[PDB]
């Protein structure tokens, strides 16, 4: 699919007065590559993968400056939003932002997005056209109004169409070894004589990249997918992901059941039994 460059900002107000915790994380596709946290003294934007270390000092200095200024911005924003909702200064609140860009086939912006949320719920969002805003309530309409009068959508759109896509292409080039590779899942079926004369078959897919995958159990003689126990896709800890799907069959029907695995790292869908 199309490659992605995404940023996730979390600002958490504290009842202990004035500051707020600010955390920023940056992803290329499903690979985290930078982080920022204002909790530690002398805080810096820091690498989280080897390839981004190819960048020089000036890069890290500029990124650190920008995220620190953004942090102070979100600190002020928490108080502004608290005011809008007529909430007390007693409780802690959160302001989240996700933004980023997808690379099209011509090396240009395919889709760009920017979205802000207050205490877990949609606050304001930039529209597909990248020129207008969707406020989710009346408090956000004040923000929508301010932004509309200051042509904020223009700068957001010029960032997404310009700097974002070019740095995404740059990052795809710096880590082409690992970023442009699809890693297929290592699959296997384990058998557990567990239930009362019922056999649990569990189909495992391990170490696949990117996130998206399809795991189903099919029964010879029926077309739809069979009911199963399916856990959510989970990180392996090394940048890959894993998943499994299990079901219990009578203790004689082991090879009447097939696990089907669909992943973009596989040349063709996979069948295990």
């Amino acid at each position: 699919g199309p490659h992605s460059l995404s940023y996730f900002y979390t600002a958490v107000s504290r009842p202990d007065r004035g500051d707020s915790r600010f955390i920023a994380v940056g992803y290329v596709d499903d690979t985290q590559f930078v982080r920022f946290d204002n909790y530690a003294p002398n805080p810096r934007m820091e690498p989280r993968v080897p390839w981004i270390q190819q960048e020089g000092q000036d890069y890290w200095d500029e990124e650190t400056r920008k995220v620190k200024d953004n942090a102070q911005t979100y600190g002020v924003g928490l108080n502004t939003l608290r005011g809008y909702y007529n909430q007390s200064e007693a409780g802690s609140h959160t302001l989240q932002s996700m933004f980023g860009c997808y690379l099209g086939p011509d090396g240009l912006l395919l889709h760009g997005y920017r979205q802000d949320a207050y205490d877990g719920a949609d606050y304001i969002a930039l529209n597909e056209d990248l020129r207008s805003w969707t406020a989710a309530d009346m408090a956000a309409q004040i923000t929508k109004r301010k932004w509309e009068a200051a042509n904020v959508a223009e700068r957001r759109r010029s960032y997404l169409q310009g700097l974002c896509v070019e740095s995404l292409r740059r990052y795809l080039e710096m880590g082409k070894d690992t970023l442009q590779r699809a890693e297929p899942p290592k699959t296997h079926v384990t058998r557990h004589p567990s239930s009362d004369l019922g056999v649990t078959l569990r189909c495992w897919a391990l170490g696949f990249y990117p996130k998206e995958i399809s795991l189903t159990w099919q029964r010879e003689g029926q077309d739809q997918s069979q009911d199963m126990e399916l856990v959510e896709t989970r990180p392996s800890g090394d940048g890959t992901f894993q998943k499994w799907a299990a079901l219990v069959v009578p203790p004689g029907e082991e090879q009447s059941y097939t696990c089907h695995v669909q992943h973009e790292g596989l040349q063709e869908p996979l069948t295990l039994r």
């Binding site: 920008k66 953004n70 990052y171």
Partner: peptide, 12 residues
């Protein structure tokens, strides 16, 4: 070159 340089923001 990666984060939006926000200046004139503290503007919600």
């Amino acid at each position: 070159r990666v984060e939006d340089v926000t200046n004139t923001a503290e503007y919600w």
